[PDB]
Design a binder for this molecule. Structure first.
Ligand SMILES: O=P(O)(O)O[C@H]1[C@H](OP(=O)(O)O)[C@@H](OP(=O)(O)O)[C@H](OP(=O)(O)O)[C@@H](OP(=O)(O)O)[C@H]1OP(=O)(O)O
Ligand SMILES: O=C(O)COc1ccc(Cl)cc1Cl
Lengths: 126, 13, 571
């Protein structure tokens, strides 16, 4: 077993191969502190790392949000993929203004630049 | 006959 | 809202051109990240944009696709020399895209110099598809074979190669092994055959081999014994003395290929040898018989055993009765192409008519895709076809006589086409023919909302017709028209439509030179090209129809390699 210390100061005991799924953990090497992952999130990460997923991702946006970031921070390649596919599939079929709804992005194109690009994309790239 | 008709890539006409 | 690397990795699961364009327009940040991880680019009209442009914006591209001359080049309605040269692309890419992997080219002029440059700039070069291109020779290919050590695909389909020397193929070194896919089939000259057998023998990943018809029937079995894993085979010549040892061998060898999904080639096929192909046949999803000149009966015998057949291309020799048997045996047909055996004589040499298409309309619930040459047709037949196949996608129906009416009835085919277009709501592709009045056009503008490519000849009565098209046709991408009374009035009244479309082709219509100059002035981001071999267009009054205008929207402005008979109307 290794123990893992959330950012919240609480403590997770996982057996040896589960913790090592994270290259970020592997390469710190009492009990491993994790300043950039909550417990909530470190919980979910641990189910995944145990299982290994589908309704697992049957989660909500702000939460995926955080799952990505931690799969990145922990370097857990499988999970980065899976949560990455999953954000992709929300992009696809969708328009800019809907993507930039679904996502809280502010448009920082001028009128003029946005048309030049559309513009380029349509006349020359599709 | 007409040029390019009927529209096909065969050899003669 | 998170870093730059996660976005990139997200992007990596996005591959459709549309999807990438869309993410590029979210916010400046995404525009930059996609830019830099865009793996492939698709350029439907090489003059629509410049290389410097493509290369500066997507500097990481691994895979490039380009298309040159308009479709009607096939019918040669574009004089030689008009353009489509790929060299400037290769030159520009050769220093920027070091890691380039894939080049796919259509209807471009491609030169031995191009081929050497590719060979010798792209070390990871994997895929070369040259599709109806011209301008190169076996010497160019020798370059590719000698140098491209990682090559997986050489696909020459339907190109015109200056045919020096079958020697070029033995330029593949013995240490070469990587080939997935050789489509050899347009070459006249004859490859070295022991080289060909050594090659096929030592590339255990060979999946698709389309021959050369100078590889004669008697040799196929040797090849096939070397590549039992094949999924697509293009025969060479399919003719030989009738002998039992040679039949027996072809046949053990073919039924050795348990992976064949696609069979093609068959030049000069002799009836006595087709049945060798039968055991393969349980399993075929693609059969192309379009160069077998065999009679309807022998076709049928073969068809009778292609239950999984999804795609057939064949000669009109198949006939109404052969097509009926078709409707009955191939319930999984998606696509039927029937080509003219004798497209240059008037009298029917073959009993093939509206009826075979009707058969197949009713019998193949999954048929979506049709190309059909016949000599007669009716409003009634079209109407039954549209009724039976509201899922049709691509409908290309060419009556060989220029303005043939309904032959029973003697009207224009307007309602038959109205019906295909009213009823087939996802029709994205139409080519029609026969006697046609401004009124089809009207139907076309009212019902054909999904339709992307439209081809037409010898049709309509006035500018109203072309107007209904440019008017009504929401999804129009490519409009191409020959020999119709469509001119200045419909073209300029719809000038602004043209910015939404890849290209308008109009040859032998009534477009005056004067409307060409006015159009160029209204619409500075169209290249409006007059293509006219009679000499300079002030030679004649501006009142005077030009021979061909080609119009296409672009961000490169006017192009640099017009020849003597093409004028751009910018100024
Ligand atoms: O998406 P596009 O640029 O519109 O290409 C179309 C489309 O080709 P893709 O296979 O590249 O989608 C056609 O496919 P279908 O309409 O049959 O689905 C193909 O036609 P073919 O199947 O007959 O090759 C046709 O080629 P063409 O105009 O030579 O008939 C080609 O259009 P372009 O390459 O001419 O734009
Ligand atoms: O679709 C095809 O390839 C053959 O049919 C046509 C081709 C060009 C034109 Cl103008 C009209 C027709 Cl019907």
């Amino acid at each position: 077993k290794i123990v893992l210390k959330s950012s919240d100061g609480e403590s997770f005991e996982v057996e040896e191969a589960v913790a090592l799924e994270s290259q970020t953990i592997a390469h710190m090497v009492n009990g491993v502190p994790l300043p950039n992952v909550t417990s909530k999130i470190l919980a979910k990460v641990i189910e995944y790392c145990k299982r290994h997923d589908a309704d697992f991702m049957k989660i909500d946006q702000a939460t995926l949000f955080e799952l990505i970031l931690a799969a990145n921070y922990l370097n857990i390649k499988n999970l980065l993929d899976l949560t990455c596919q999953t954000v992709a599939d929300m992009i696809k079929g969708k328009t800019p203004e809907e993507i930039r709804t679904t996502f809280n992005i502010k448009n920082d194109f001028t009128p003029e630049e946005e048309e030049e690009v559309r513009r380029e994309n349509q006349w020359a790239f599709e | 006959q007409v040029v390019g008709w009927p529209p096909v890539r065969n050899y003669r006409k | 809202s998170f870093p730059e690397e996660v976005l990139e990795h997200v992007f990596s699961f996005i591959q459709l051109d549309k999807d990438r364009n869309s993410v590029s327009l979210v916010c400046k940040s995404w525009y930059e990240i996609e830019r830099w991880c865009r793996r492939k680019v698709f350029i439907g009209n090489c003059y629509a944009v410049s290389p410097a442009t493509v290369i500066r914006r997507f500097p990481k591209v691994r895979s490039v696709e380009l298309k040159g001359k308009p479709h009607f080049a096939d019918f040669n309605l574009v004089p030689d020399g008009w353009g489509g040269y790929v060299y400037p692309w290769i030159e520009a890419m050769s220093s920027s895209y070091t890691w380039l992997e894939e080049i796919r080219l259509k209807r471009m002029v491609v030169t031995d110099d191009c081929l050497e440059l590719i060979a010798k700039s792209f070390k990871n070069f994997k895929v070369l598809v040259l599709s109806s291109c011209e301008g190169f020779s076996t010497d160019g290919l020798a370059a590719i074979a000698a140098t491209c050590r990682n090559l997986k695909e050489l696909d020459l389909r339907e190109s015109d190669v200056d045919d020096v020397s079958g020697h070029w193929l033995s330029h593949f070194p013995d240490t070469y092994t990587s080939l997935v896919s050789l489509n050899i089939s347009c070459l006249a000259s004859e490859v070295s055959f022991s080289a060909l057998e050594r090659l096929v023998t030592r590339c255990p990943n060979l999946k698709s081999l389309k021959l050369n018809r100078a590889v004669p029937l008697e040799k196929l079995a040797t090849l096939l014994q070397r590549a039992p894993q094949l999924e697509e085979l293009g025969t060479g010549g399919y003719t030989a003395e009738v002998r039992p040892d040679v039949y027996s061998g072809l046949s053990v060898a073919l039924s050795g290929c348990k992976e064949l999904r696609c069979l093609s080639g068959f030049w000069d096929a002799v009836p006595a040898y087709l049945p060798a192909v039968y055991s393969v046949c349980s399993r075929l999803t693609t059969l192309n018989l379009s160069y077998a000149t065999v009679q309807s009966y022998d076709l049928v015998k073969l068809l009778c055993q292609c239950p999984k057949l999804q795609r057939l291309w064949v000669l009109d020799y198949i006939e109404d009765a052969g097509l009926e048997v078709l409707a009955s045996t191939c319930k999984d047909l998606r696509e039927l192409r029937v080509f003219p055996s004798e497209p240059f004589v008037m009298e029917p040499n073959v009993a093939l008519t509206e009826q075979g298409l009707v058969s197949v309309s009713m019998g193949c619930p999954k048929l979506e895709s049709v190309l059909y040459f016949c000599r007669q047709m009716t409003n009634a037949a079209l109407i039954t076809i549209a009724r039976n196949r509201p899922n049709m996608t691509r409908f290309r129906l060419c009556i060989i006589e220029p303005k043939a009416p309904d032959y029973l009835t003697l009207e224009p085919l307007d309602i038959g086409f109205g019906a295909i277009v009213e009823h087939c709501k996802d029709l994205r592709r139409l080519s029609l023919s026969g006697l046609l009045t401004d009124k089809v056009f009207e139907y076309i503008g009212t019902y054909a909302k999904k339709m992307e490519m439209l081809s037409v000849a010898f049709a309509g009565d006035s500018d109203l017709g072309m107007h209904h098209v440019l008017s009504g046709c929401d999804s129009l991408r490519k409009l191409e028209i020959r020999d119709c009374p469509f001119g200045d009035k419909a073209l300029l009244a719809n000038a602004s439509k043209l910015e939404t479309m890849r290209s308008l082709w109009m040859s032998s219509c009534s477009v005056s030179f004067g409307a060409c100059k006015l159009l160029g002035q209204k619409m500075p981001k169209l290249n409006v090209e007059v293509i006219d071999e009679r000499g300079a267009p002030d030679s004649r009054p501006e009142s005077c129809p030009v021979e061909r205008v080609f119009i296409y929207r672009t961000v490169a402005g006017p192009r640099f390699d017009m020849p003597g008979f093409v004028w751009n109307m910018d100024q």
